[PDB]
Amino acid sequence: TSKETFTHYQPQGNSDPAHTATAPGGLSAKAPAMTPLMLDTSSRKLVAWDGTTDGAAVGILAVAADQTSTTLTFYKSGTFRYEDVLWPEAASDETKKRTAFAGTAISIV
Amino acid sequence: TSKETFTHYQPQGNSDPAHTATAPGGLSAKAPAMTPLMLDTSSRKLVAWDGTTDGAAVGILAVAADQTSTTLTFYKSGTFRYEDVLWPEAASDETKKRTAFAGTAISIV
Amino acid sequence: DPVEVDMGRSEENNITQSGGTEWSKRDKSTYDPTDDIEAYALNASGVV
């Protein structure tokens, strides 16, 4: 009756090494891993990426955290998959979603 | 830390036999087995007991049925544990819920 | 209680002759059914 597919979790799509880094955060709502991140223009803390500002994307969340999480870890390097990364609903254009992490060590595939 | 525990289901209360009879079923909504039922007044049809009509209880469902199930079976006699029988929220008076099967081969325990 | 048993039959394994040229519209003297047989048998996932 029930049909559950046993699929492997594959966040990385490339052999390029991925590295974690710790930073202060200003997260406002609960966010799971693989969440895009950005710097608050005033407080200079880390929050979930809006999906609107161009180039504001900086990294991708490593471990899920709450508002009280003063320090959070995130991937500063590596290549990830366009489908295994959750996105803010604001980022609608496929090209913008693909190129949001341009110019840094975080890449999409 | 899921404390799912483990409790056996013993709907029977004593050595009284759980005889079953089958009658046409016309339940309006999806309901599981072991539900109380009453007899309608318009077409002498069978639906799950409302919990408000006094003395309306006639049968207790045996096998889970739904709207498409035109006919269903139900226990005729025995003793059923009050914690082991689900009830409509309409009936709240404990004494009335216990006495819902007065004069019938179905009894509460 | 009703229950379901879905072995996973892909629709390619339940072909039907539906269409305007099933088998009877074709002339028996002229047509060769073996082509239909092998066309149906190609997606069999094993030797039949």
From Swiss-Prot, chains A, B:
GO cellular component: host cell cytoplasm; viral capsid, decoration
Subcellular location: Virion; Host cytoplasm
Annotated segments matching region Disordered: 1-27
Keywords noted in UniProt: Capsid decoration protein, Capsid protein, Host cytoplasm, Late protein, Viral capsid assembly, Viral release from host cell, Virion
Gene3D superfamilies: Head decoration protein D
Main location: virion
Complex and partners: Homotrimer. Interacts with major capsid protein.
Record family assignment: Belongs to the lambda phage gpD family.
Protein role: Stabilizes the expansion of the capsid head shell after genome packaging. The packaging of viral genome in the procapsid triggers a dramatic reconfiguration of the capsid shell, expanding from roughly 50nm to 60nm while the capsid thickness decreases. 415 capsid decoration protein molecules cooperatively bind the expanded capsid, thereby stabilizing the mature capsid shell.
The protein's name in its UniProt record: Capsid decoration protein
Organism from which the protein derives: Escherichia phage lambda (Bacteriophage lambda)
Lineage: Viruses, Duplodnaviria, Heunggongvirae, Uroviricota, Caudoviricetes
UniProtKB/Swiss-Prot annotation, chain C:
Domain of life: Viruses
Subcellular location: Virion; Host cytoplasm
Family from the record: Belongs to the lambda phage major capsid protein family.
Subunit structure, interactors included: Homomultimer. Interacts with FI protein.
Function: Assembles to form an icosahedral capsid with a T=7 symmetry. The icosahedral capsid is about 60 nm in diameter and composed of 415 major capsid proteins. The assembly is primed by the interaction between capsid assembly protease and portal dodecamer, and major capsid proteins assemble cooperatively to form the procapsid with the help of capsid scaffolding protein. Major capsid protein forms hexons and pentons of the icosahedron. Viral genomic DNA is packaged into the procapsid through the portal vertex.
Protein name per its UniProtKB record: Major capsid protein
Organism (species): Escherichia phage lambda (Bacteriophage lambda)
Lineage: Viruses, Duplodnaviria, Heunggongvirae, Uroviricota, Caudoviricetes
Included range, full protein: 148 to 195 of 341
